[PDB]
Symmetry: D3
Subunit: 233 residues, 6 copies
C-alpha cells in the first residue's frame, strides 16, 4: 500500500528493528522471535512481526545508502505508524579507540551527502538520534555487561571511498567509524517527529586492517541483536 512495502496497516508494531540486509532480518526473525510472520517483501526487502520475551517487535530491511534507507523509514513512519526505529549494522572503525567486536552508539551522524543541505536550508543539519532511546541503549548495555562505545559516525555515499586520506581528521573529531545510512535515518526521523537510534558493531578496522573471521562476525552481530531486542523489551 506504499510503493515499497506491501504490508497491511497495523502489521507493524510501533517499535521496529532495522537492518540493511533483508537476509539478516530473516535470520533475526527465525532465531530470536516467537510466532514471527513475514509481513512485507517488495523487491525482496523483508519485514517481519513477532514477539520477543512476550513483547511485540518488528523488523525491516532497508537496503544500502541514505537514499534507500530514507525511502523505507519514510513509509514506515507515515503509513505504518512506527514510532521507534532502532537500527543495527556493521561498520569500519576509523578511530584508535574502537576495535573488532565493539558496539558503537552513534550520538551524531556526519555525512558527505547533500540530502541534508537539500532538506535544511542549505545549512548544516546536525543529524542526531532521540536521546531517550540512547539512554535505554546505555542503560541496557551496562546491565548486559557490554562496554558500549559512544561517538559520532560518518555516513558516506561511498563504500569505495575517494577520501580515505581524511579518516584521521574524522577520527580527530570523534568519529569512531564509517557506515552509510545513519545520517539518513536520523534526518528522516527528525523530519517526521519519530524516535531513532543507530548501533554499529566493528567488523573491520580501516586503519590497522584487522578483520573478523566470517563466524566471529556472526557471534558479534548476535551480541548486537540481543542488545537491541533487550532495550525494546
Amino acid at each position: 500500500m506504499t510503493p515499497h512495502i506491501n504490508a497491511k496497516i497495523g502489521d507493524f508494531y510501533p517499535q521496529c528493528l532495522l537492518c540493511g540486509d533483508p537476509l539478516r532480518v530473516s535470520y533475526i526473525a527465525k532465531k530470536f522471535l516467537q510466532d514471527a510472520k513475514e509481513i512485507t517483501n517488495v523487491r525482496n526487502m523483508l519485514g517481519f512481526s513477532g514477539k520477543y520475551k512476550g513483547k511485540g517487535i518488528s523488523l525491516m530491511g532497508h537496503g544500502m545508502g541514505i537514499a534507500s534507507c530514507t525511502i523505507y523509514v519514510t513509509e514506515l513512519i507515515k503509513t505504518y505508524q512506527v514510532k521507534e526505529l532502532l537500527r543495527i549494522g556493521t561498520c569500519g572503525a576509523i578511530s584508535p579507540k574502537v576495535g573488532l567486536k565493539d558496539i558503537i552508539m552513534a550520538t551524531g551522524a556526519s555525512t558527505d551527502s547533500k540530502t541534508n543541505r537539500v532538506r535544511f536550508l542549505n545549512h548544516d543539519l546536525s543529524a542526531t538520534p532521540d536521546f531517550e532511546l540512547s539512554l535505554r541503549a546505555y542503560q541496557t548495555a551496562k546491565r548486559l555487561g557490554i562496554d558500549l562505545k559512544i561517538g559520532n559516525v560518518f555516513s558516506s555515499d561511498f563504500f569505495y571511498s575517494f577520501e580515505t586520506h581524511a579518516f584521521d581528521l574524522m577520527a580527530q573529531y570523534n568519529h569512531l567509524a564509517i557506515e552509510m545510512e545513519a545520517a539518513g535515518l536520523y534526518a528522516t526521523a527528525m523530519e517526521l517527529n519519530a524516535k531513532a537510534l543507530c548501533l554499529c558493531s566493528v567488523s573491520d578496522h580501516l586503519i590497522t586492517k584487522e578483520a573478523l573471521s566470517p563466524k566471529e562476525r556472526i557471534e558479534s552481530f548476535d551480541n548486537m541483536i540481543i542488545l537491541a531486542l533487550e532495550m525494546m523489551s
Copy 2:
C-alpha cells in the same frame, strides 16, 4: 570474493542488464532467458547468467539510489570484468513530450547528489552514457519499431521529493523523467573506463498523474526488456 556479490570470478558475461528490483531480474531470467543460472544472492540481490538466442548475457539487481548502484556497478566492473552495463527500469515523467508506455534513452543524468562533486573536483561532472551503446539502442529501437524518446534524466536522492515545485524547470531543460541511480551508473562507468546506458519505461506521469494499470505495466516493461536483450545480441 566481494562483500556484495557471491559469484565466482568468471560467471558474468561481459554484457549485463541491471534493475533496482531483483525480482525484476528473476522475472527476466525466467520469462526470457534459456539455461538461466543464479550466480549471486548476497542481501537477496539476485544475479543471473543465461542465454538469449544463443548469446550469453547477465542480469544483476542493484537496489535503490546512487550509493547502492555504485557499489554493485563498481564490483561488477572491477572484480567480474563486466564491459557493457545496460540499466532498465521505470521512472516518473515530468515532460509533456512523454507519456505512459514511452521508453526513454538517457543521454545525460543530472542530479541533486553530492557524489559527483566529491568525485570530480567539486565541479560539474556531466554524467553521460557511452556513445556506441546509445547508438545500438537507437538502431535496435528503429529495427524493432519502438519510438525511442531521447533526453536527460534527473537522478534524485529523494523518492519523496522536497522540490516538486522544480519539475517544471527540469522539464524545460530537456529532463524527461526522474529516477534515482543513472547519474551514479554513468559516473562509475566513466570512472572505471567501461560502457553504460540507462533506459527508462514511463509508468507514472508526475505532472498529469496518469498511471498505467498493472496489466499495462507488465505489458510495457516487457517491450523494454526485449529492446535491451535485442541490443545485446
Copy 3:
C-alpha cells in the same frame, strides 16, 4: 599566557562553566561560589575560580558568536588544561514543545556558519556534546526534579536573522531554540578531545511572542545555574 586570557597557568580548575555574558559570570561567582577569585579579565571578559560545596569550579565568559566562543574554548583547553566545558545561557524558543522557564539540553547543534565545513572537509559535521556530560545533566535534572527538554538547537551567525521564515522548518526538525555558539563550542571540543555540553533557558518564545519579565528572567536563570553547579559536584 594567550592573547585573550591573562590568568596564570594552573589558575583554572579542570571543570569550567561558560556564559556568553561576562557579567553573568561575575554574578554567579559572587552569589554562588566560595573564595571566588578573578583570574582573567582581558577585553573585560571575566574568568573566575572558586569553590562550590568544597569542590573547585572555574567560570569563563566567551562573548557572542561561534568565532568568539571558539577563541576562548580553544585557549581554555590548550593553555589552561580545562577538560569539561559546560555552557549555560538563554535562547529563543521556536518549537511548540517548549515554553517559558524551560531548560533545554542541546544534544546537537545545527548552524548556518561555514566554520564546520572549513574544519571538516566541506562535508556535514554533526556537532554533538559529550555523552557522559549529557547523562550527568539528565540525572542531575531528574534528581532536582527539573523537566529537561532535549533536542537540537540552531547556532546562527545572525542575531538579527535574515531567515526568520525558516524557524518553522527548524522546529519541525527538532530544533527547540536558537542561539549563537553551541556549534562552535561542540566542534572545538570535538577538535581538541574535551568534554562539552550546552544548556539553554527559555526566556522568550520567538513564535508565540511570550516573554519573561526582567525579574522572572533572573529567577529562571538561577534555576539553571544551580543545575549546572550541581552537575559538577
Copy 4:
C-alpha cells in the same frame, strides 16, 4: 534588432555554424560558401549567411567563455530563429586516447563555471548535445572516412588554469579535452529547446605537449570545416 547582432530578421538560416573566433567565420565563408554575405558585425563579431552546395547555411562567431557564448546563442535562437547550432573549434587535449589532428565530438560538457548551478536549482545539470545532431556527425564522419573521437569535454572559465594538477583525473572520467564554451552552448540550447553539438579539433595536447606545425593547423581545421558543412547539407 538585438544588442549584439546587427542582422535583419530572416538573414540567418535555421542551421548555423559557430566558432569562437570571427576570423575563422570569415575564413569559412570565403573558401567554402557561395553567394556569401556578411549579415552582422557588432563588436567586430562577424556573422555570415551563404550557400554550400546549393543549401543555405549561416555562420556566426561568439567570442570566448561561457558568458560570451551564451549571449550570442541566446540571440540566435530567440530572435533570428536558428534551430540547429553546430560549434566547431580547437581545444587542448588531455587524454592519452586522443592525439594531434583528431576531431572530438563532445557528448557531454563538464565545467568549473557556476552558470548551470544558477540556472538549475544549484544542482548538477549534465549539459549534453542533441542526440540526433550527434548521430548525423557520426554518420557523416564515417561516410567521409573520419574516425571521430567521442567523449566528454571540460568547459573551463580559465584559459590559464589554476588546476593543471587535475587534468589526469579529468582524463580518467573520459574528458578528452579542455575548451571554454560547450557547457554554455549546451545549457542555453537546452533552456531554449534548440539543437546543438560541439566539435573540437585537437591542435595541441596539453599533456604530451605536442603541438602540430603551422601547415597542419589549417589542414586539420579545414577537415573539421568540411565535416561540419557536410552534416548540414
Copy 5:
C-alpha cells in the same frame, strides 16, 4: 606573441585602457590619440598604441564576460608588461542613486561567477581596484567637474539574467550597476600585482528602463573617455 595578442613585445605602453568592444577601442584611437597604430588584431580583437597630448598610452579590447576579460588582461601583464589597466564601458544601472550619463567608479565588484572561489580557496574574494588609481580618478574627475558616482558593481556571467528579482537586493547593498567583467579584471590584477580600475557609464536603467538616445550615448561615453585619458596624463 601570445595566443590571443599578436603585438610585438614592447608595443604596449605601461598604461592601457580597456573596452569589451574592439570597435570602441578603434573609435578612441582615431578620435583622441595622436599617431595611433594598430598593434594587435587576433580574433578581430583590436589593440592600439599612440599618444594622448604627447604621452604614450595603449588601448585593448577584451571581449565580454569574466573569462574573456581574464585571458586578455593576463597576457597584457605577464607578456606585454602592462602595469596600469583602466577599464571603461557601459553598464545597466540598478540603483535609484544613479541615472543616465552618470559615471560609476567601481570600488568593488561582486559576482555570481565561481572563478574567484576557484582562485581563492572557495572563500569570498573581495574583488577591488588599486587604491591609488581610484584616487587619481577621483581627482581628475574633480578637475574636469565630473560628478563621480562611487560604489560596487555586480559582475555577472549572465547578460540575460535569471535573477532580475534580486536586482533590488543588490541595489540595497550599494551595487550601483551591473556589468560582466570587473570582478575578473580586479581579481586578475590582484593575482598578478598590477593596478586596475573600472569606470562605468550608465546608458540604460534596468529598473525604470530609461535610456539615452544613441546620439546621447556617443556624447556620454566621450566624457568617460576623456576622464580615462586625462587620469593617465
Copy 6:
C-alpha cells in the same frame, strides 16, 4: 535601547570609533576625550561619548568575530542613528613586507564566513568601505605624517586558522593581514546605508611569530587612535 546597548536617546554622536576590545575603547575615552562619559555597558561591552578638539565623538566596543560585530553595528545604525563607523583594531600580518604595529587601511574585506553568502543570494558579496571615508583616512594620515598601508584584509571566523598553508596565496591577492570583523562591518554598513571604514594595526606576525601582549594591544596603537580621532574632526 537594544538588548546589547543600554545608552540613552541621543547618547551617541553620529561619528563613532569602534574596537573589538572595550578596554581599548575605555583607554581612548580616558586619555583623549574631554568630558568623557560612559554611555553603555551591557555585557561589559563599553561605549563612551566625549569631545576631541571641541567636536563630540563616540566610541563603542564590538567584541570578536563577524557575528558579534554585526550585532553592535546593526544596533548602532538602527537605534542610535550612527552615520560613520570607523573600526580601529588589531590584525596579524601574513607578509614579510608588513611589520608589527603597521597601520593598514582595508579597501576590501575577504572572508571564510558564510554570512555574506547568506545575505547576498549565495553569490560573492564584495565587502568594501565607504570610499569618502577611506579618502579621509588617506589625506588625514598624510597630513599627519602617519604611514598607512592600503590593501585587502582577510576577515576569518578563526583566530587559530586551520589553513595556514594558504597565507602566501592570500598575500599574493593583496591581503596585507588577517582580522575577524571587517567583512561583517562592511557588509552591515552596506546593508543599512551607512559609512564604514576599517583600520587595523599589526598585533601579530603570522609567519615569523612575533606577538604583542594584552596590555600592549591597548597602548602601542596611539598613532592609529590619533589617526581616527583626526579624521573625525
